[PDB]
Design a protein around this ligand. Structure first.
Ligand SMILES: CCCCCCCCCCCCC/C=C/[C@H](O)[C@H](N)CO
Ligand SMILES: CCCCCCCCCCCCC/C=C/[C@H](O)[C@H](N)CO
Lengths: 246, 48, 297, 97, 246, 49, 246, 297
């Protein structure tokens, strides 16, 4: 038995890792299907299981020596991907937790540390005209970037007035290049409602941001990519209609 | 929305056009929770 | 066989949220057991990996020889009820005789807790909160003088007719709650239940409330959850002739039976707008004070 | 149950009684749209003729299933099959059947 | 056994029907004689039974292709008819429920739907001078039409500010020409008093009004009559005096 | 035509899940609907009018 | 209880009918999920249930007084329709039975009889150059017409050398205008394999063809449409991959 | 509760096919019970609705006064085994000395049951069939003469090396079955098992075997299921010098242990091609004979 060697099998997907930290269970609470006492919709939901509950590789950013960090908004990342997104479009109501496996590996002569974090209801603010006298709002491509994700305007402030200096409150996991090469976060369905639109509302936001900068000598590898992988758990859909998008 | 699945079909001596009446109510799992004033007040301007 | 096995065993529809941790009672602060020296190989508390995502499990008993301490320090002061049962400023309603602001002794205020940083930041520590409320209404003149006037506060829930006049027909209040106070009387105080359609209020709605295309027009409605938009608040003079005094009404909110859920980092930038986390981009400030060098105090 | 005023025509305050009924006729085509309305009970305006609609007007919040019953008032010789669709929140007016 | 074939025998009267809807029991409550605990008058009432408890055919309107609908006010309809009205005149106090059998039949190539409704305390208002600035009141022939009944001024508004759009609250029954050819309503004595004058006060009002217009091709029958029939149930009279009328 | 409301339940019109409904019906009672003080009269006593 | 009045509720769909014939159960055998002894694929299949198991209205042909009859090939009819077709595209293996509800209604003064039939493995042949000396093959639009379906070249021969004179062998149901106005066929998964491609192979073919011609006098309705409705039962999908089409 | 109810009750994964009907034994034809006159209202057997889709349930005992008949007529002759255990012509292989056809005493025949209408139509009555087979090989000269030649029949399953010569290296037959017969010897006969990857052979494949686009090129592969394409059949001379006699080999197939499944209407048009239901379009014939008038014989 060991702590750093792990394997994650969901549906027909499988992730292996030999240099990891222990798995974080979000808020000390495993993802679950919705009870008959929490639910309110009378429709009999579809629980497609294997077809949608599986790992998805959606993006791969290049961690350069001077990067501000990126973020993704869930579950807008999958809405056009796979047979999960198909159910999320034909339906009004959706419910699921995720199994995020951020991954980034380098040599032993590289250094740097990422900060993987899952911040629920990550509302994004705008630079108010530089001076503070403009009630502007972010475009659709900033609040719902989707596949490619979005680069932070400023990383210190989390583009919302809140400090990254205390982001390790909500479920997080560091990727420190000298110890681990991947992070794994399991979150349950975090919402005040038993179901939600999945298109309009975004349950949380994945914040992949470096705090200690990537550095390396004149070695033989300067291209160090971070890759994002996720997998819906206990997925439920209700309120069937026509195919609707963004 | 209301669509024609097939057609409104009539013999020789009967109307080509008919009417449908829609009645509406709530099911038995229906409840109400917070008391507001009527959306429209029926008075302009003083009574009597 | 019958039926198929991958349905019999299948954990699809498992209702209860599997708890990784249960709550223990902590009336007093944790006591400290006695400790002695330890020179061993393998037992190493101090060494830990922050990468994991967990906080330091290393206890002080294993980092230094400690005495016995029967800690009886109470943790009651640090509870959600005893932290939020503090009435704070949440609104200021102005009724001047003649100005740019409302000049007819009728003001309407769409109920927004924010717009006052101190009560806001304290509340913005959590993402979801569920609570009953105790509202207090302080009325006076802009100098603080007490005058013989008779106000009417009226709660106008979403969809109810909003007053468009000082003597509007909506002031009959046949259903929606309203309060009749004199300024001579002490502040009016009212208890309010949790009335969101959701299980909790949200200080953050990471999304849009409407469907369709979100062009640069309907882009200001981002972050607008109607579940904690509990309607508007209206004041009267009362009519029918205009008042004789300039009036100011201050609304104070006290929370009771509080239940917050998921924690949030704490604002370090000046609030600029209501229900909107915008910030001055060129005036980005550090979260705290700063010094000249890391090797000096 | 009470009359759902799906037909909305104030013209000309004399033909007001037409507001209580659908026109349905021998369409010489396939799957033509007959009528359409919002399922929102407290919203304007077809539900505003119903007793449920006005009683809902005295309450800000509601919950539960609703029933809309359609009675055909043609001749006994008249027949016909029609689809009646409920499209949950999200999605636009169904362009075709 | 069947639901649409019915027969109504009261006293020496008998109504048959083969194309009906089920019988409506008013407010889910069968008509009854007045208890000794509800009553207040000390007089020993007359309960003439058979002689007055029987069907009366009082009117027959012609349902034309463009009719606004009619109404009758109970129990002013019988006051000059039969031996029921005789008791209602010689007495001060009266008590009874009714068994209304509205009837109207056409071919299978006719179409249209009536709305039979029993609206208690149907107070009638006037067009206030067209503009609204006149507190006029209806004549006797409008509030107490009696035998022939009265044609609605406006049918949408029920000549009282109330909408016909929600008349199906109080005990009603449709006469849809493609399914039924008669309606039947059984009401109990609906009043806040155990007895009333029967001349001055009118317990309720029968509203026969078409919503889906009568229509027919150039067939061999354009004269389609609606006929009103009613029958007092559990009739009681007290406070005997001389014969008094309207 | 009968004069009755639709007896058709949602369980027989669509495949439904289980819902333990605990929504209270207290707010919709005659006492809690009419225990709301409303304006019913305005009496004027002017100096001269 | 009655035989001709029926109601079919599947998922969030519901079909009513008052003038029908009894329901045909295909080959006297109700549709079922695949056993662990018949199956061979080791993948854990998705059984999306409600979302895909529901009625679909896909076409409406106009029955003219001189029509040869039409056909559809299953399950190519749904491949681009709904969230059923989505699963059928992202997957390699598919399994389901159907509940076909062909419907066509006219007056009592119309006449004619349709023949609804479900012919498994309905392979289509071509007119061999008119003379018989050409081994031509049908286009894709003829063997896999999909939504709109295909009109028969010749109806006597079933475009395959086989006679329609004996089509009532395989599960059928007549739509005779003077008695019924709809047909209903429930078929199970009819194949020699536990699963199949659903894109390449077509389990069966629906043959809607009139034998006794539609006829009517100069009445007020000459447009008599036949409408096809179907609903997958016990749907299973396995072998997940990317979205693939025709 | 736990878990959710709509999963507990849910019939998802029900394995056994619900049988609407079970099979009863019928060794003899059905016996006929005695019948008498019946003049009643309500009991009406003769009246039926063909619309339903069912066959007439009306028995002869209720349509005419009948006697008693102890029917002992056997139904054995009408079984799938005793109907298909009839050897029929399924192939004719020609080995002429010099012609357009195969001139080197080696012919290859991709095994196709069709191409001979009588055996085809009988078989085409069902869509799916599963059976073991008994093949017989009759060899002679085009005149029917028996000559002292030595043939070699070889079964070449899918993927096995096909002979490209009269003296090919594939004739070593180290694995795949082959038979060595003289024409002097009586017909060679071989029993063959059911060897499809599917549970049954298909006489009809309503689809394509390949994916992708199906343009007018790959349109001839429509209706091609490789599951009942059991390979090729090869004959030798044997080598090494060319034969001295013209040869003809006829293949006969007998079915045993037969199990057909779903029934099919019966061909009424001339077969034109193998594995392809094409027909002459201008020469469309009625299924049977025709007469001059419906009121004459
Ligand atoms: C007699 C008057 C009583 C008024 C009752 C008002 C009670 C309202 C409870 C507070 C609801 C949450 C406040 C709203 C949240 C924030 O202000 C913004 N919506 C943030 O988006
Ligand atoms: C020693 C030689 C033995 C040869 C063994 C051959 C056995 C083959 C069994 C018959 C398989 C079914 C026949 C093929 C079906 C039809 O001809 C076409 N494929 C129709 O598409």
């Amino acid at each position: 038995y060991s702590d750093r060697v792990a394997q994650l099998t969901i549906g027909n997907s499988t992730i292996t890792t030999q240099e990891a930290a222990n798995i974080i269970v979000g808020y000390g609470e495993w993802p679950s299907y919705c009870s008959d006492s929490d639910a309110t919709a009378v429709d009999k939901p579809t629980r497609p299981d294997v077809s949608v509950n599986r790992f998805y590789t959606l993006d791969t950013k290049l961690w350069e020596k001077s990067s501000k960090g990126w973020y993704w908004k869930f579950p807008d990342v999958l809405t056009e991907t796979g047979v999960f997104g198909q159910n999320a479009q034909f339906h009004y109501l959706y419910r699921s937790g995720f199994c995020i496996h951020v991954q980034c590996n380098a040599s032993k002569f590289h250094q740097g540390a990422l900060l993987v974090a899952v911040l629920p209801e990550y509302v994004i603010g705008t630079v108010a005209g530089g001076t503070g006298t403009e009630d502007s709002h972010p475009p659709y491509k900033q609040t719902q970037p989707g596949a490619d994700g979005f680069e932070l305007q400023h990383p210190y402030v989390l583009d919302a007035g809140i400090p990254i200096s205390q982001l390790t409150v909500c479920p997080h996991q560091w990727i420190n290049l000298r110890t681990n090469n991947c992070a794994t976060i399991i979150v349950p369905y975090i919402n005040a409602l038993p179901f939600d639109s999945a298109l309009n509302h975004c349950n949380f936001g994945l914040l992949v941001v470096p705090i200690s900068p990537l550095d390396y000598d004149q070695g033989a590898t300067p291209v160090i990519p971070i890759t994002i992988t996720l997998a819906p758990m206990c997925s439920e859909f209700a309120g069937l209609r026509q195919a609707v998008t963004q | 929305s209301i669509w024609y699945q097939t057609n409104y079909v009539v013999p020789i001596g009967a109307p080509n056009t008919a009417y449908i009446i829609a009645l509406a109510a709530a099911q038995k799992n229906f409840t109400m929770q917070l008391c507001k004033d009527a959306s429209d007040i029926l008075q302009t301007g003083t009574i009597q | 066989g019958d039926r198929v096995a991958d349905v019999i065993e299948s954990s699809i529809g498992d209702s209860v949220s599997r708890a990784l941790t249960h709550a223990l009672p902590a009336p007093t602060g944790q006591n400290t057991q006695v400790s002695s020296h330890r020179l061993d190989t393998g037992k190493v508390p101090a060494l830990q990996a922050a990468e994991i995502g967990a906080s330091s499990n290393a206890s002080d008993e294993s980092m230094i020889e400690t005495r016995c301490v029967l800690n009886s320090h109470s943790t009651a002061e640090t509870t959600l009820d005893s932290f939020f049962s503090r009435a704070g400023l949440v609104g200021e309603i102005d009724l001047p005789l003649e100005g740019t602001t409302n000049p007819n002794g009728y003001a309407n205020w769409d109920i927004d807790i924010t717009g006052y940083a101190q009560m806001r930041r304290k509340v913005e520590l959590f993402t979801y909160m569920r609570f009953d409320a105790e509202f207090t209404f302080v009325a006076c003149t802009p100098t603080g003088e007490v005058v013989p006037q008779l106000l009417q506060y009226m709660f106008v829930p979403p969809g109810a007719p909003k007053p468009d006049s000082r003597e509007s027909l909506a002031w009959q209040t046949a259903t929606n709650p309203s309060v009749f106070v004199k300024l001579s009387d002490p502040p009016a105080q009212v208890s309010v239940p949790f009335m969101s359609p959701a299980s909790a209020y949200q200080w953050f709605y990471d999304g849009y409330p409407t469907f369709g295309e979100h062009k640069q027009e309907k882009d200001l409605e981002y972050g607008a959850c109607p579940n904690n938009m509990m309607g508007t608040f209206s004041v009267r003079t009362v009519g029918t002739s205009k008042s004789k005094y300039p009036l100011v009404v201050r609304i104070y909110m006290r929370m009771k039976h509080v239940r917050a859920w998921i924690p949030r980092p704490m604002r370090n930038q000046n609030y600029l707008f209501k229900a909107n986390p915008n910030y001055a981009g060129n005036s980005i400030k550090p979260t705290g004070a700063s010094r000249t060098a890391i090797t000096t105090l | 149950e009470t009359i759902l005023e799906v037909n909305n025509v104030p013209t000309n305050a004399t033909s007001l009684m037409e507001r209580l009924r659908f026109p349905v006729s021998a369409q010489a085509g396939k799957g033509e749209l007959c009528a359409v309305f919002r399922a929102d009970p407290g919203r304007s305006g077809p539900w505003q003729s119903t007793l449920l609609g006005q009683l809902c007007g005295y309450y800000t919040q509601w919950s539960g299933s609703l029933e809309v019953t359609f009675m055909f008032t043609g001749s006994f010789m008249a027949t016909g099959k029609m689809l009646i669709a409920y499209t949950p929140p999200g999605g636009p007016l169904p362009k075709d059947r």
